[PDB]
Paper text:
Endo-1,4-β-glucanase from the earthworm Eisenia fetida (EF-EG2) belonging to glycoside hydrolase family 9 has been shown to have the highest activity at 313 K, and also retained a comparatively high activity at 283 K. The recombinant EF-EG2 was purified expressed in Pichia pastoris, and then grew needle-shaped crystals with dimensions of 0.02 × 0.02 × 1 mm. Recombinant EF-EG2 hydrolyzes soluble cellulose (carboxymethyl cellulose), but not insoluble (powdered cellulose) or crystalline (Avicel) cellulose substrates. The enzyme exhibited significant activity at 283 K (38% of the activity at optimal 313 K) and was stable at pH 5.0–9.0, with an optimum pH of 5.5. The overall structure of EF-EG2 has an (α/α)6 barrel fold which contains a putative active-site cleft and a negatively charged surface.
The crystal structure of EF-EG2 was determined at 1.5 Å resolution as the second example of eukaryotic GH family 9 enzyme following that of NtEgl. The crystals belonged to the space group P3221 with unit-cell parameters of a = b = 136 Å, c = 55.0 Å. The final refined EF-EG2 structure includes 435 residues (Phe21–Gly455), which have 23 alternative side-chain conformations, two ions (Ca2+ and Na+), seven crystallization reagents (one citrate, one Tris and five glycerol molecules) and 694 waters. The overall structure of EF-EG2 consists of 12 α-helices which form the (α/α)6 barrel fold, an additional six short helices and two β-strands. The location of the calcium ion is conserved in GH family 9 enzyme structures; however, its role in the catalytic activities of these enzymes is still unclear. TRS is recognized by the side-chain carboxyl oxygen atom of Glu431 via direct hydrogen bond (O—O distance: 2.6 Å) and by those of the Asp74 and Asp77 via water-mediated hydrogen bonds. These glutamic and aspartic acid residues, Glu431, Asp74 and Asp77, are conserved throughout GH family 9 enzymes, and are thought to be crucial residues for its catalytic activity. In superposed structures, the location of TRS, GOL1 and GOL2 loosely corresponded to the glucose units in subsites −1, +1 and −2, respectively. The negatively charged amino acids (Asp and Glu) of EF-EG2 occupy over two-thirds of accessible surface area (ASA) from the total charged amino acids (ASAAsp,Glu: 2900 Å2; ASAArg,Lys: 1300 Å2) whereas those of NtEgl occupy about half (ASAAsp,Glu: 2400 Å2; ASAArg,Lys: 2300 Å2). CtCelT has a slightly higher activity at 303 K than NtEgl, but almost loses activity at 293 K. Thus, it seems that the highly negatively charged surface of EF-EG2 contributes to its cold adaptation under 293 K. The increase in surface negative charge has also been described for cold-adapted cellulase belonging to GH family 5 from the Antarctic bacterium Pseudoalteromonas haloplanktis which retains sufficient activity at 297 K.
Numbering used by the authors: 21 to 455
Amino acid sequence: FQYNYDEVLEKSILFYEAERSGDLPANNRIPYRGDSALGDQGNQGQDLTGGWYDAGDHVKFGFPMAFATTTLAWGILEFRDGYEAAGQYNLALDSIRWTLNYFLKAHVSDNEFYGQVGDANTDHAYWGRPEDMTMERPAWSISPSAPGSDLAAETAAALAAGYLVFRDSDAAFANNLLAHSRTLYDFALNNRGIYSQSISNAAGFYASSAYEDELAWGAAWLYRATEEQEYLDRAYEFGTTTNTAWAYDWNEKIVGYQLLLTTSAGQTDFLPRVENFLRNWFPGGSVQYTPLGLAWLAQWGPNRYAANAAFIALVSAKYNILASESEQFARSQIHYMLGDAGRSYVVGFGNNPPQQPHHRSSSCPDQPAECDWDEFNQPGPNYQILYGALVGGPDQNDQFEDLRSDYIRNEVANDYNAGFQGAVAALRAIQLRDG
Ligand SMILES: [Ca+2]
Ligand code: NA
């Protein structure tokens, strides 16, 4: 079946706009959103306003925020023609300019980087508009005494990918991103550790299992950006040619750097593991499929895992790695999400989309009405439409209740849309083909 990818891209970008924290521009397209968290600051009063709220909450979780940005940037680089065909290319640049600017703010000095604003427990205890928050919002950083090679190298990857994206429109901005990428990557190498041990507030939410894959990923991005041999050396030092990724996601960069190195750097040693990942996902592999055709990796965000795999498959296809099966697989997954199994899983799009995403700001009625946990519990649709949000998804039998309190299936998050959006742009690009 066919879907309007131009509309999907427009809406996915609007989802990210609805996640913006800080001082919103005059041209803000999300009418229920206003200025919020203007007090966000470091421990010496450094400005930390901006960035994205992670999910349906108001925490700024730097690790997924950075990974979502690296992934979105990669899709812009590879599938620029799809974004352009859709009229969404400059809106996509404006989308990630938001988080790139936040990463610059968070990098307060060479070897201090702010990785979280908001205490997840006090943040999640509040249900209401971000514009109405009154609780203390602590900020935490990584440093030599409290390292985070994973967070620092992921942010370096986002900044290096950002340099590549932006050097074609705002070269001064792009080259500033590159300078910070180099510095953060050096910090990551010099001060080894797991960021969610150093910023332990993150450990119940975005716990990092290992940092070596982020070291390889940051090096691969900096090699693409600079072509300096020392970065390729670092990629080989930290990268695996013998292990196959379970997922491409905010925690596990393995197939990301393997594919990036094979395609952008021409390093075929990593190619067999890319093929293993793809074939694990394709029908007949290790990932179970629901009866209606979703490749269902796990209970949490199966749409996210499949959309991420579809993204990796479409980058692979672009570079003529298993292109036929990759395109077929990716299209099957994205089209599942768009409506092939009977409903859209994208809020505000297509047939019978979810109306109750687990999301605070869209759950609240129009100002000046009050908003509290009653709006969590109320049995009807969210008062605002969270256009473009890809929800967590159905269970393994394609069941979905569309209940706000079903926080697993009705979850929305920055990382959920990041592979998805690039995959949609890739499918839009494929439509440009002769014939
Ligand atoms: Ca990792
Ligand atoms: Na404003």
